Design a protein around this ligand. Structure first.
Ligand SMILES: CC(=O)N[C@@H]1[C@@H](O[C@@H]2O[C@H](CO)[C@H](O)[C@H](O[C@]3(C(=O)O)C[C@H](O)[C@@H](NC(C)=O)[C@H]([C@H](O)[C@H](O)CO)O3)[C@H]2O)[C@H](O)[C@@H](CO)O[C@H]1O
Ligand SMILES: [Cl-]
Length: 228
């Protein structure tokens, strides 16, 4: 068991999209009659005129290899660029924003570390739209620090440090490579402010328990070992 996000919200959205595609197929929508391996949930634009970010069930065969980028979701409900792009003329998808949004809300309650939630809230309050990671900055692929990252600048396929549900080291999808592209500048380093936000969270365990983090809330709280 790795100290890493299980990406449980994304898994649930993909499974719900597979069911929705199957239902549309039964309604006669031929292009939705596919195996489950062809269907994922992505938060993205759609065809021409569908210019807002919405949750949609996409046939992966209709997605472009690169980008109109598509976004996946972390277990605190934040959308982050994932591999691929929308073909604005040829996309094969079903927009299902309400049900998929509701599933994200339900998932956040289950899976989002209160420590990470606090760090994310600090970042969004100070720099709207940003989320917290301890990851790379611009043109340096070694150094990590707690920063408020513009979500568009993160890579879902790259895991980066985040806060567990015990306020301990954890890794989450949505990270930086430390490259030197323009996107690599889109962050605000906030070591003191993020650390304070994390330290302000009340423990799920008593002062007489050891917190062992888990990929779902709550963590394990074990009775501290006695002076045996
Ligand atoms: C704002 C400024 O110039 N501050 C001076 C200090 O510089 C900042 O130091 C921090 C170290 O914590 C960062 O290296 C700085 O760079 C970034 C960052 O926060 O990582 C780089 C980002 O690309 C940039 N984000 C953008 C352009 O979108 C981000 C923001 O500009 C700032 O965070 C906004 O506050 O900065 C760097 O700006 C300097 O260390 C100090 C003494 O030398 O004096 C500060 O005034
Ligand atoms: Cl996560």
């Amino acid at each position: 068991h790795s100290p890493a996000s299980g990406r449980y919200i994304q898994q649930m959205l993909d499974q719900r999209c597979q069911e929705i595609a199957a239902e549309l197929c039964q309604s006669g929508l031929r292009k939705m009659c596919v195996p489950s391996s062809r269907i994922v949930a992505r938060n993205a634009v759609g065809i021409t005129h569908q210019n807002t970010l919405q949750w949609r069930c996409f046939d992966t065969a209709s997605l472009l290899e690169s980008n109109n980028g598509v976004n996946c979701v972390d277990d605190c409900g934040h959308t982050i660029p994932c591999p691929g792009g929308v073909h604005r003329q040829n996309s094969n998808h079903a927009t299902r924003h309400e049900i998929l949004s509701k599933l994200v809300e339900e998932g956040v309650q289950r899976f989002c570390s209160p420590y990470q939630a606090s760090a994310n809230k600090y970042c969004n309050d100070k720099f709207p739209g940003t989320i917290a990671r301890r990851s790379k900055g611009f043109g340096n692929n070694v150094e990590v620090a707690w920063r408020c990252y513009e979500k568009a600048s993160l890579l879902y396929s790259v895991y980066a440090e985040c806060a567990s549900n015990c306020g301990t080291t954890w890794y989450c999808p949505g990270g930086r490579r430390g490259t030197s592209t323009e996107l690599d500048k889109r962050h605000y380093t906030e070591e003191e402010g993020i650390r304070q936000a994390i330290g302000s969270v009340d423990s799920p365990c008593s002062e007489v328990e050891v917190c062992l983090p888990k990929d779902e809330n709550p963590p394990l709280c074990l009775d501290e070992s006695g002076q045996i």
